[PDB]
Design an enzyme around this catalytic site. Structure first.
Site, PDB file in Angstrom:
ATOM      1  CE1 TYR A  38      -4.415  -1.620  -0.211  1.00 42.33           C
ATOM      2  CE2 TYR A  38      -3.521  -2.964   1.648  1.00 42.33           C
ATOM      3  CZ  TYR A  38      -4.514  -2.745   0.685  1.00 42.33           C
ATOM      4  OH  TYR A  38      -5.510  -3.680   0.657  1.00 42.33           O
ATOM      5  CG  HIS A  40      -2.165  -1.765  -4.651  1.00 38.62           C
ATOM      6  ND1 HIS A  40      -2.083  -2.365  -3.418  1.00 38.62           N
ATOM      7  CD2 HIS A  40      -3.382  -2.101  -5.143  1.00 38.62           C
ATOM      8  CE1 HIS A  40      -3.176  -3.060  -3.200  1.00 38.62           C
ATOM      9  NE2 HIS A  40      -3.986  -2.912  -4.223  1.00 38.62           N
ATOM     10  CD  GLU A  58      -7.007  -0.770  -4.028  1.00 41.25           C
ATOM     11  OE1 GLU A  58      -7.171  -1.189  -2.872  1.00 41.25           O
ATOM     12  OE2 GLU A  58      -7.497  -1.314  -5.045  1.00 41.25           O
ATOM     13  NE  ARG A  77      -8.061  -1.761   0.376  1.00 41.13           N
ATOM     14  CZ  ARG A  77      -8.508  -2.496   1.415  1.00 41.13           C
ATOM     15  NH1 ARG A  77      -9.068  -1.963   2.484  1.00 41.13           N
ATOM     16  NH2 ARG A  77      -8.360  -3.803   1.385  1.00 41.13           N
ATOM     17  CG  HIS A  92     -12.947  -5.242  -0.567  1.00 46.88           C
ATOM     18  ND1 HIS A  92     -12.844  -5.676  -1.869  1.00 46.88           N
ATOM     19  CD2 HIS A  92     -11.729  -4.747  -0.242  1.00 46.88           C
ATOM     20  CE1 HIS A  92     -11.620  -5.457  -2.312  1.00 46.88           C
ATOM     21  NE2 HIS A  92     -10.927  -4.889  -1.348  1.00 46.88           N
ATOM     22  CG  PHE A 100     -13.489  -2.120  -4.428  1.00 40.29           C
ATOM     23  CD1 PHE A 100     -13.292  -1.824  -3.051  1.00 40.29           C
ATOM     24  CD2 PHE A 100     -12.336  -2.371  -5.224  1.00 40.29           C
ATOM     25  CE1 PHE A 100     -11.978  -1.754  -2.449  1.00 40.29           C
ATOM     26  CE2 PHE A 100     -10.982  -2.316  -4.669  1.00 40.29           C
ATOM     27  CZ  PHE A 100     -10.800  -2.003  -3.281  1.00 40.29           C
TER      28      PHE A 100
HETATM   29  N1  LIG Z   1     -12.052  -5.219  -7.184  1.00 38.97           N
HETATM   30  C1  LIG Z   1     -10.962  -4.680  -7.628  1.00 38.97           C
HETATM   31  N2  LIG Z   1      -9.868  -4.945  -7.110  1.00 38.97           N
HETATM   32  C2  LIG Z   1      -8.773  -4.204  -7.441  1.00 38.97           C
HETATM   33  C3  LIG Z   1      -8.731  -3.181  -8.298  1.00 38.97           C
HETATM   34  N3  LIG Z   1      -7.425  -2.648  -8.424  1.00 38.97           N
HETATM   35  C4  LIG Z   1      -6.716  -3.399  -7.582  1.00 38.97           C
HETATM   36  N4  LIG Z   1      -7.467  -4.373  -6.921  1.00 38.97           N
HETATM   37  C5  LIG Z   1      -6.946  -5.252  -5.766  1.00 38.97           C
HETATM   38  O1  LIG Z   1      -6.855  -6.615  -6.236  1.00 38.97           O
HETATM   39  C6  LIG Z   1      -7.663  -7.528  -5.481  1.00 38.97           C
HETATM   40  C7  LIG Z   1      -8.465  -8.170  -6.525  1.00 38.97           C
HETATM   41  O2  LIG Z   1      -7.729  -9.330  -6.737  1.00 38.97           O
HETATM   42  C8  LIG Z   1      -8.526  -6.791  -4.486  1.00 38.97           C
HETATM   43  O3  LIG Z   1      -8.725  -7.549  -3.243  1.00 38.97           O
HETATM   44  C9  LIG Z   1      -7.819  -5.373  -4.436  1.00 38.97           C
HETATM   45  O4  LIG Z   1      -6.828  -5.112  -3.487  1.00 38.97           O
HETATM   46  P1  LIG Z   1      -7.067  -4.457  -2.129  1.00 38.97           P
HETATM   47  O5  LIG Z   1      -7.400  -5.650  -1.355  1.00 38.97           O
HETATM   48  O6  LIG Z   1      -5.755  -4.018  -1.992  1.00 38.97           O
HETATM   49  O7  LIG Z   1      -8.133  -3.453  -2.066  1.00 38.97           O
HETATM   50  C10 LIG Z   1      -9.971  -2.877  -8.869  1.00 38.97           C
HETATM   51  O8  LIG Z   1     -10.263  -1.899  -9.476  1.00 38.97           O
HETATM   52  N5  LIG Z   1     -11.036  -3.665  -8.523  1.00 38.97           N
END
Ligand SMILES: Nc1nc2c(ncn2[C@@H]2O[C@H](CO)[C@@H](O)[C@H]2OP(=O)(O)O)c(=O)[nH]1
Ligand SMILES: [Ca+2]
Length: 104
Positions: A38, A40, A58, A77, A92, A100
């Protein structure tokens, strides 16, 4: 009243501003914290109506009011850009799996 509601979680504007400034400082120095690295790139797979430009990054916003430094991220986030402009606060919570939904 909550300025942003992420499932059960209540966030004010100051909560969002403190988390964002912590996230941007680490982004510019090229440093990351915790096991999931974090901040990313927030890729936007869901297709949200963010009124600021791309690329998006995020960073976790914790319910307790503390800033993230390692350990458990939680569900919520804050999304900022390269300019340090807020895109939105996402979660989430109430979304299927690793997906999301926007905070109300
Ligand atoms: N759902 C979703 N996940 C993302 C995106 N960009 C990065 N991710 C990250 O990749 C994972 C999906 O495999 C998520 O658990 C999330 O990480 P974070 O847990 O860090 O929020 C996005 O736009 N959508
Ligand atoms: Ca608070």
């Amino acid at each position: 009243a909550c300025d942003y509601t992420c499932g059960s979680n209540c966030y004010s504007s100051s909560d969002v501003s403190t988390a964002q400034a912590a996230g941007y400082k680490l982004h510019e120095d090229g440093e990351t914290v915790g096991s999931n690295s974090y901040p990313h790139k927030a890729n936007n797979y869901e297709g949200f109506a963010f009124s600021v430009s791309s690329p998006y990054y995020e960073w976790p916003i914790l319910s307790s009011g503390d800033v993230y430094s390692g350990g458990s991220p939680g569900a919520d986030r804050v999304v900022f850009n390269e300019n340090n402009q807020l895109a939105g606060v996402i979660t989430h919570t109430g979304a299927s799996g690793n997906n999301f939904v926007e905070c109300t």
